[PDB]
Design a protein around this nucleic acid. Sequence first.
DNA 1: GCCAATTATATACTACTATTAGTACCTAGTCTTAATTCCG
DNA 2: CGGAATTAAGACTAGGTACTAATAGTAGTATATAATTGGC
Lengths: 186, 183, 186, 183
Amino acid sequence: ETLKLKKDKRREAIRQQIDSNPFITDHELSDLFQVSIQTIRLDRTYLNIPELRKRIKLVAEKNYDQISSIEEQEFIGDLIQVNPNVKAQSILDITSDSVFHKTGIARGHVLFAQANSLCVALIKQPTVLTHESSIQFIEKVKLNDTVRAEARVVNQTAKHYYVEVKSYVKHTLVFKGNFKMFYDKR
Amino acid sequence: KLKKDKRREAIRQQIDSNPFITDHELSDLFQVSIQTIRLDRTYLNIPELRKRIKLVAEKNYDQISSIEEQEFIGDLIQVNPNVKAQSILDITSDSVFHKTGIARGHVLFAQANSLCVALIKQPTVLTHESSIQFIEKVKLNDTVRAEARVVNQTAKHYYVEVKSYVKHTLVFKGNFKMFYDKR
Amino acid sequence: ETLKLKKDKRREAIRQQIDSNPFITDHELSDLFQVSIQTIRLDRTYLNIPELRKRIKLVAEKNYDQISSIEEQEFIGDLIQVNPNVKAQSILDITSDSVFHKTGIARGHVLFAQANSLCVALIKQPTVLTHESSIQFIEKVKLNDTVRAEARVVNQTAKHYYVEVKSYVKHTLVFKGNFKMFYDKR
Amino acid sequence: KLKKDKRREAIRQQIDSNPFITDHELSDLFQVSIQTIRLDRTYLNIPELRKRIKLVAEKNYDQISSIEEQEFIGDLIQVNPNVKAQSILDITSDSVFHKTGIARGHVLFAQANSLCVALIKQPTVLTHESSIQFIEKVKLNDTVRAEARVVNQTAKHYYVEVKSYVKHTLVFKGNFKMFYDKR
DNA sequence: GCCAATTATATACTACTATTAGTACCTAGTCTTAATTCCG
DNA sequence: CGGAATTAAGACTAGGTACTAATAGTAGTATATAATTGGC
């Protein structure tokens, strides 16, 4: 009886569904939203969403052009700035998936993952591997916080790179980590 | 200039080099009818343009949530509250560096940290400090058996020692300072 | 029996027609463009043009809220800057309607109109009337030129304001005008 | 609290203060039925909302081209090429300052300048210099009779004297230096 | 001169676009007639 | 309890919105069957 979603609300829900799954057909959207295929076609038109085949092409073209490297995909956080073998900075927005549901505090491994990722990105060498790490959780990182991690090369031997990581939330040190990165010119 | 077999070998290479090519474009490029390309692609088991584009799109899609978005890392096998606990982690393609095939540093720490939170049976448990060592390189398809033991316990902290193995080979060692509160 | 205007071309022509006459109905547009009233409604939707009654309201609301004064409507050119009874500057884009069709040169009265208008705007007094003017057309103002007129109060008696107008096109003096503006504090 | 006549008086003033008001809004404000509001507007000769909004929109609309976008200013009466010419200009509401009711300075100059271009029978005619005087105030509904006479002619210029009248009363005097070219 | 290879031709498909048509409903009225209140 | 004032009820309108439905056309195929050419 009550079609819960009005014109504007339905269109935003359609917009989000197409993003979430570009491989969806107008027929499936019509069944999901309990609206005519003609309404779905009108909705995509107004929202400037192209047809299925055009969406699939754009997804394939991004992958074919090789936009966003393997290095970018397997990295925790967003890399902001890199000075090879000198200093690097990454950011990490703390989402509901990173916090303990009961407390709303970020899990230990979340902050270490960003820190370790930053070190591998910082060292411009063929083979880079973490050998040792000494970490400290100064303050509780809570939900919706954005962690600004900065890594600096403090020392460099013939076999290792010594990195100091300092992570902040609104210029408040929340994490400190010392990294022993093994490096090889092969 | 190109005979049946030679043309097909050039068609398969052209489609491999550009999957976005149409049968019409191939007809003009090879100076042959559209019906021939349809027969050629059939013999070479090459699907139509739209099916080719879909496969390209489908390949770099279906991304599994990265380690920071994961709750318990690994599979919890045994737990003796505030005593000893053990978890198993199968190293999949998602855990290794594509180039080297070696597990990422944070992958093994994630399993260790997760195991510590599971081991301490208290209302609020938080990691305060950790000192970790990567003894051996954990490679693809290895199964990491992590074992955590409570070594000390103060009024505010729990001291845990984690030892991770691949068969009977120590690959990881970690010391954990777990803060605990009975509130 | 071809319909000269395609989807995109028709929509631009519709947009311009509604801009030129907001009082137009969807029925007239359907007849003018030789398409169905439904296509017209679809076109306005995509172009984010509201219905007739909503358009008429917006026209009435602008007029009611006193947006653009009577003084601003009776003015030749666009008033850019005013320092009451000191210095003022107006702009005038030379359109096809301002030039002699054969030559492409602006008509004499066009430049004087902008100059005179600027003087009335410059003098902040209840009653302002032009009594005398001495003007000179230094260079030929052609089509598509933008005339930058600047008026300055050079003298002021008990009954008059003496204004010097200098009009330029890309920093080239094209017009010079001396104005004797009568003023009364009534 | 408000009787028939008193309510209508207040309704008339409310619609005058806000023409965008609906009959529904008036029914709630005056604590009376919509049918009554409809009867009130009828007796007060007030049209419906949509008709009221249209009249507001229509008033500040339908604008004629400003003097700078006009070719010949006035109506050309008589022309004796390169000798004497006369033009007539009826001073409409569009030519006067709304508040004073006096014709704008540029209106009378426009008629004068236009008359000079019409007077000189040459391929290219351009105003080079002009010295003008506004003797009397030209008001709304006056008809300006402008007469231009060629006083001198050089190899490059035509010297014209313009005298504009209302009734028989000199309101404008102008001296024009018109450049002329045979090519 | 045969058969394999190649082209022509005729049918259908999916997932659309662009356009036409048509329904129910909306606002803010109209115009009419009928019933029912206040108030003196 | 009367008539003037007021409200209620019913039937219509313009210029739409919002939605459903359906058609011709489209790309880039498919399936199958026939007819023609080219190569030894």
